[PDB]
Design a protein around this nucleic acid. Structure first.
Ligand SMILES: Nc1ncnc2c1ncn2[C@H]1C[C@H](O)[C@@H](COP(=O)(O)OP(=O)(O)OP(=O)(O)O)O1
Ligand SMILES: [Ca+2]
Ligand SMILES: [Ca+2]
Length: 511
DNA sequence: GTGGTGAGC
DNA sequence: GGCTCACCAC
């Protein structure tokens, strides 16, 4: 009291696209798109945001627009089953390649749920394509990178944002933003701003108490506040508010430029953000103040298994290692180690060396048992700041096809599928160039296949480039050769009908 | 060198 | 239930 809890160092740190995730005064934001594949379709067919449109594949649903969710339809339903829940459902099948053609297409009006035995899309001579969804994913991304200097791509429909710089700059140099009638930020934060340029301060001096006037700063979106704590008490709250503001803008552009609704979570931790974004859907924005982190993590919807990269199996074990009750398990980890990370550290040691398990089926690395420590201890409190980072360069790319029926008998059929693969792969190589804005070419190509008896033939080798920058053809040129040798490699053995053909590319070069 | 199979879109 | 992708014991 009598002075803010955060120091200048922690504030100024928001302007560093490298040491920003530390401050705790951080302001990260996660954004996921609602019923994505459902939407990009809901958009492509000029339908409305409120039409029970579902995205199907063969006989299974893979995306359910929220309009059609109101009828109880979910992912664990089959087009057939779903229609009995809502006869006005608008099922739309993804685009697909046809055995033999080097281009995918949209067979609208067609689908297994169609009576006409001619408007069917057999899974025998067709392969689902996801370019459309990738094509859109990037757009949204481009729209992001234009509003945020540091953007991490979580997955095809998710992205994290480091609203550090934008918040700091707004908090210091924005002479436009208005709080209400006649009251701009330039007057409400005069004290903090005048002090900033003054430089008269030690980077360790606790910032001044937030000006009484700033409390009239409104948050944008639902502020998780069950206990009803005050909205703006310290700076981290002020920065977060400014974030929600900015964040709303970004999310509005997407909706206007592409027309995609999204859920969004704001907090000082990517992890905590990941949760908040999924807390409410669709088209909403949850906000978890640092002084609500515990109230949020214990609202009664999360567990130690709901934590990204900790809910597959390592999470399962964690329970069998710390007893971890089957409910209020997160809080339990907090109230059992109110010491520090160091405490739980040893507990891990004196819980592994004995007669409980074997280092043959445990994802818990003994030596680095200090990491797993601080991790759980931090997560439990909602303070595990992970720096945003780019996904490591791709190592490979597979264009498979689990064949069925007696389709694949001759080599002209394999060749017929190799064209397809060659297309899809010459479609993910381009999307990669655009992402790293660097030219990419695969120096090696292999072709695997499963015979009738389910055996495995595979030939791998280099790819000759008769020029300097092609692919879509020379890839099939070689691909074929292999598919031939293998054919000869099994003339009088269990071969056709094949049960799985597939082309893979590795040994990439990023010039 | 991988197929087994855990993780995730 | 489907389709892709990174690893790493046997
Ligand atoms: N079981 C599955 N089968 C096929 N595709 C899936 C499956 N699970 C996820 N996907 C992929 C295809 C979808 O376009 C994409 C959607 O992103 P996801 O994060 O799963 O949520 P969603 O967009 O379907 O709904 P939400 O609004 O809850 O985010 O995930
Ligand atoms: Ca989603
Ligand atoms: Ca997702």
């Amino acid at each position: 009291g009598r002075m803010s809890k955060f120091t200048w160092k922690e504030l100024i740190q928001l302007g560093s696209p490298s040491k920003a995730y530390e401050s705790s005064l951080a302001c990260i934001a996660h954004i996921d798109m609602n019923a994505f594949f459902a939407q990009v379709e809901q958009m492509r067919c000029g339908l409305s945001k409120e039409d029970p449109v579902v995205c199907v594949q063969w006989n299974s649903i893979i995306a359910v627009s929220y309009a059609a969710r109101k009828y109880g339809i979910s992912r664990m339903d089959t087009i057939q089953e779903a229609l009995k829940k809502c006869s006005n459902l608008i099922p739309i099948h993804t685009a697909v390649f046809k055995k033999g053609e080097d281009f995918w297409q949209y067979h609208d009006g067609c689908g297994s749920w169609v009576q006409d035995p001619a408007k069917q899309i057999s899974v025998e001579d067709h392969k689902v394509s996801l370019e459309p969804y990738r094509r859109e994913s990037r757009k949204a991304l481009k729209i992001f990178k234009s509003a945020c200097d540091l953007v991490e791509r979580a997955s095809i429909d998710e992205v994290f944002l480091d609203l550090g710089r934008i918040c700091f700059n707004m908090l210091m140099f924005d002479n436009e933003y208005e709080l209400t009638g006649d009251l701009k930020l330039k007057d409400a934060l005069s004290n903090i701003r005048e002090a900033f340029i003054g430089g008269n301060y030690d980077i360790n001096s606790h910032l001044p108490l937030i000006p009484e006037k700033i409390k009239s700063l409104k948050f944008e979106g639902d502020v998780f506040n069950p206990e009803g704590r005050d909205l703006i008490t310290d700076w981290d709250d002020v920065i977060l508010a400014l974030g929600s503001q900015v964040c709303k803008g970004i999310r509005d552009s997407i909706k206007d430029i592409l027309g995609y609704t999204t859920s969004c979570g704001l907090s000082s931790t990517k992890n905590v953000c990941k949760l908040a974004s999924n807390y409410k859907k669709p088209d909403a924005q949850t906000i978890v103040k640092n002084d609500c982190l515990l109230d949020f993590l214990d609202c009664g919807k999360f567990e130690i298994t709901s934590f990204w990269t900790l809910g597959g199996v390592l999470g399962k074990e964690l329970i069998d290692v710390l007893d971890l009750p089957h409910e209020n398990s997160i809080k339990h980890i907090r109230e059992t180690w109110p010491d520090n990370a160091g405490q739980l550290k040893e507990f891990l040691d004196a819980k592994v060396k004995q007669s409980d398990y074997d280092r043959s089926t445990s994802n818990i690395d003994p030596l680095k048992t200090a990491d797993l420590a601080e991790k759980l201890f931090k997560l439990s409190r909602g303070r595990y700041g992970l720096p945003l980072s780019s996904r490591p360069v791709v190592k490979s790319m597979m264009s498979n096809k689990n064949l069925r029926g007696k389709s694949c008998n001759s080599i002209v059929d394999c060749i017929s599928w190799l064209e397809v693969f060659c297309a899809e792969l010459t479609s993910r190589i381009q999307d990669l160039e655009q992402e790293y804005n660097k030219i990419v070419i695969p120096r090696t190509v292999s072709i695997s296949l499963k015979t009738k008896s389910y055996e495995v033939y595979r030939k791998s080798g280099p790819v000759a480039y008769k020029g300097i920058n092609f692919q879509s053809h020379e890839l099939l040129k070689v691909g074929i050769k292999f598919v031939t040798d293998l054919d000869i490699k099994g003339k009088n053995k269990s071969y056709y009908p094949l049960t799985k053909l597939s082309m893979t590319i590795t040994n990439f070069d990023i010039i």
